[model samples]
Target: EVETFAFQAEIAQLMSLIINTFYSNKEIFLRELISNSSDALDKIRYESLTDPSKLDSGKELHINLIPNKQDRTLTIVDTGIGMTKADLINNLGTIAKSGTKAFMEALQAGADISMIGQFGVGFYSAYLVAEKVTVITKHNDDEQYAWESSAGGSFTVRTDTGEPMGRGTKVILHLKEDQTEYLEERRIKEIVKKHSQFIGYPITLFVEK
Candidate 1:
């Protein structure tokens, strides 16, 4: 059986807390993810200082915003440090069980990363706009893994060798079934410039003209 975990039951309450408190400022979801990507890229660079192979020198670190009109999905891809199965369970899995009330407080206080540095809560904000979130990640030391979760449901992690990404993560947000918000590429550009403009890595939006 694919590894499955019913997120700490309390996460149901936690999800509602975030969905209600942060949904209005949903655009920041892009900001938070891009910022996290920058952090991962930073980590990989710093790690390479000690272990050269971690840098995988031939591949440059960067992020991509890919839109799929046919599938109604917008993917935030990054070529940074990747996460393992354990990472997916803790970092992406249960960290939110620590509760997101403090998460809301930090946001309203202008994002004091002191409280925001914990990565998991911010990731859940993906539910603000998308009904489902798909995370496909691979680490240099581990095999590829995919994690899937809905707005307020359990998550499953399974090995998906299909993507065969070199290294990094892809956060693909699938649009809501009844919602018309396909999230235009133009808006993503605005979000990137407004929130993550100064980020060191290149945040490229692959437009399929």
Candidate 2:
């Protein structure tokens, strides 16, 4: 059986709609990232339950938030099923996913696409408040890969060479000058609760903790 891929042109406008007006508030960027981290932990846990040997025993299922007010940097870290180099590019580079395409097609055919945005581009919400974004992810199936983008119409991905975490992913957002409100610990925590408290995992905010 031959599998068919949808034409890219069909979703270009949808991408623009998302990147331009997906989230209503800038503070929700933190919420979106935390929700994504929670989802990652959920995925890894589910995988571990079915295949114990595949689990990274050294890693625990949790979420960590690091805020640096001085540099206006916010980091969201998670112990979840990370992404490989290929997954990094496709997932972070283009927001085009099989599930997303199917959702859009269904919408075009008059089906509701309310669930389309929930798949994974929650990662891209970082671009809404960041001048630069860096993703350092280690997947069980492949080596660590780093993806960096400024939303300047291009992104870069390469094998990461650094001290590795046992498992999961870390995303650092270099907040834009005007969007530094996200660097506040209190503000971040409130945003997390408002959008991600029901994420079904523990979420922590830390500057030094």
Candidate 3:
């Protein structure tokens, strides 16, 4: 039960541009993704104000970073405002089709728009370090869905009926064999210190023995 779609033409162009230009600062991927997670956390908290049941029993709003050496992947899990199937396609596939045109321009110019959270487009930087990106998201109002991509051309979306997912999203980056720097625990903390320490929610990295 999976549907795949090719990225829009403009998005494919930008994808190539980002990968070719961002090697010197590829670390921004961590900053941007962590920042995006905080936005998700804040959205749920804000929505819960109007409808307390919006949050319901899932009160642990935090971001957890897991690095798997054997799997060659890094996963960022957030108990935040999750998305539906439509949201997955609209948000991830089209890449800012609704809003943020200016942000897109800023990205093209290599401008730093820290004032605006990365939202959707910054998620593309995931391709910088990953050969593949798999997003598992569960909305309180919807069933879990998996959005996967290789950034070569297209992405797929499907109902993830495998494991139980709470509310929020988990972005798993299958780190490219050459992109070894991203999976290390220490630099992630350092990247957060530089860019994401301002986030109100907690972003914790589990210690592996």
Candidate 4:
């Protein structure tokens, strides 16, 4: 059962602002994605504290980054609390349902804003460099699924037939023509070190020997 949903009006507007005006530094996309992965890992760890089984019997928590220069793709994989179908729709669809209004008010009031994801729209920043974004995720309780969008107004989600992810999430970015720098190992390492070095989880970059 595949379903598609349009972004809320405010969300659409916020994405427009992000793509056209808000962020001047494109590399921050890495920071936001890494931050998101850290948050997901934290959620599962917290849940495991009491349940013990919630961590899948002490599965390792880490982030893996793969850059394929030939394919012009950058993939970020995380063994974290993955999303269910409903979680995908609710988390990615609404796009700052509550936070956007407050964010706009703050901007209007001349408030200082430095962090990405402050308005719950950080994921959409993938569109800043990728022509398309694909997310394949599996949760402990939900079947594997894929969510895809071009940062247009709408996105689609469907059951995934790819190899099972165990319980995690993978974000694949099809880099834009001018955004190929992201596919370079040196550039990616530099960005990660500059922006995400202090991240609480292990971050590994896959490089060719």
Candidate 5:
């Protein structure tokens, strides 16, 4: 059902911008991912009432920001909507239908550039700083999968054997050498507060216990 639709060439062009130039500051990468996590948390909470099974995933809704200064890796793990193979391809591979095109047209026409963000390409912002990224996700209905990629066009997806996340997603960014500023605790806090403070979801940083 998912593979029937194909990505347009314009989407490729737009994805280049989406992955490359859409954002002004690289620090907003965490902001975008956390905002996505907040949306997923909201979805589960909304569906929990009539569908008790949905609530089986647990009630602890929070986003954890972890930075490994040694390896230069920054991981944003969340209990949110995990992706399937088709989803990994469709959602992450290309820009949505008419989404990037519309944004480009608007930019060409000088329409309000702010509204361009509504096009649903926020996740691609990860490519702006990370040389490699791994999205570890598990859905309630399927086995967990690891979706990995470099900023280049290709990505790899493999079945994961680790204990299921139960129902959520985790994104690990292997930061580029030039992007190491994101590995700092203080920098992570400031970025989260600046872009995602009002996200309506609890965001926290982890420390060694």
Candidate 6:
């Protein structure tokens, strides 16, 4: 069954702070996303070590960045460990529920943060550049589902009846007015080269010639 839930009061305030405070380094959105994808891939790879069949036989481990200039959308797809419905809610919704005040205080104190995935805040960074964010994912144990949010306090999760994604996640970012540079091939290449070149998985950029 599809469901919607509101971010905790602390999470709502955290989102507002992140969006307003990170404007100067909005390009890190892509870096943060790619880092998350790498982490996902690493997870499944490690899991496969114990049970080879847990890994999807067809989907190779890799990341693809597709830019749609016409629609002003940037899509990041990864053949990694996909999240289940419950995981979608807990991982993406709760927003550091474990230590809310301390986390917020750390950011406020200018903590030298390295990766967003560490705090489960990487996913929300998409809001820094996009007006809307959609995550379509499939896990071996769960049916395909889509989670959507506009950096608002609440988000919706629904069963995705579209073609099966096999196993992984696809994040589509609808670029904001000033974020059009993210849709350019040259610009994307530069960012990927600078921040993501060391990624363990192959990163491909789908660009029109």
**How would you encode candidate 3's per-residue C-alpha lDDT over 88-134 as one tens digit per residue?**
87865334653356566765688664422444577877777888999
User: Tens digits of per-residue lDDT for model 5 on 1-209?
Assistant: 11123335665565466565555567766777787788777777777767878757666777888888877888888876566667777765335666776777777877543444566666766767887888888766667888876644556678877666778888999988988888877888888778776887778897632
**Model 4, C-alpha of 177: deviation from truth (Å):** 0.7
Q: What pairs collide in candidate 5?
A: 80-168
TM for every model, in the order presented, reads 0.84, 0.77, 0.88, 0.90, 0.84, 0.90
RMSD (CA, Å), each prediction? 3.4, 5.9, 2.6, 2.2, 3.8, 2.2
List runs of model 3 lying over 4 Å from the truth.
Answer: 93-95, 98-104, 107-120
Q: What is the C-alpha lDDT of each candidate?
A: 0.74, 0.69, 0.79, 0.82, 0.71, 0.82
Q: In model 2, what lDDT does residue 131 have?
A: 73
RMSD of 5: 3.8
**Number of residue pairs clashing in candidate 4, backbone atoms closer than 3 angstroms, sequence gap of 3 or more or interchain:** 0
Please identify model 2 stretches exceeding 4 Å from their true place.
Answer: 1-24, 93-116
Question: Where does candidate 4 clash, by residue pair?
Answer: none
Off by over 4 Å in 6: 57-59, 93-95, 112-118
Candidate 4's residue-wise lDDT over 1-209, tens digit each?
A: 77888977877776676666755588888888898898889888888889878776338899999988888889999998889888888855335778777777877877533354777667877877888889999888889999987777888899999988888889999998989988888899899989898988999999954
Ranking by TM-score: 6, 4, 3, 1, 5, 2
Off by over 4 Å in 5: 1-12, 18-24, 92-95, 110-116
Clashes of 2: 0
- Scored by lDDT, model 5 comes in at 0.71
Number of clashing pairs per prediction, in order: 0, 0, 0, 0, 1, 0
